Amino acid sequence: MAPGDIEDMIKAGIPGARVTIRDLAGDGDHYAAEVVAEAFRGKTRVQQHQMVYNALKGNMGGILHALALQTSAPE
Ligand SMILES: [Cu+2]
Ligand SMILES: [Li+]
């Protein structure tokens, strides 16, 4: 996945989301993502994270450990 592809996939799959991606260790391998989306309001963190995994569509190997997640509804 090229730089920016994680963010692109999240925003395509969760329309309206605000996404902040940081590359842990600058390593091109493990990342952290913050995703803020109205569709998350009232959902649990487990339910919100499920929506993010869905948006990546299996394109990121090892996503369970390789994409550390923070999610919320807009403030
Ligand atoms: Cu790994
Ligand atoms: Li990284």
Here the CATH number for the domain that contains residue 73 is 3.30.300.90
Backbone φ and ψ for 20, nearest 5 degrees, come out as -125, 115
Structure resolution, Å: 0.8
Q: How was this structure determined?
A: X-ray
Distance 31 CA to ligand 2 centre (A): 5
* Number of compact structural domains in the chain: 1
20-31 core/surface letters (b: 16 or more CB in 10 A; e: else): ebeeeeeeeeeb
- Contacts of residue 44, Cβ cutoff 8 Å, sequence gap at least 6: none
Starting from the CA of residue 22, give the closest ligand: 2
Enclosing domain of residue 18? 1-75
Eight-class DSSP state of 37: -
Q: Which of 70, 30, 31, 38 is nearest to 52 (CA)?
A: 70
Residue pair 63/5 in contact (Cβ under 8 Å)? The answer is no
Q: Where are the beta strands (DSSP E) in 1-75?
A: 18-23, 31-36, 67-72
Q: Which of 24, 25, 31, 19 is nearest to 71 (CA)?
A: 19
Distance 62 CA to ligand 1 centre (A): 6
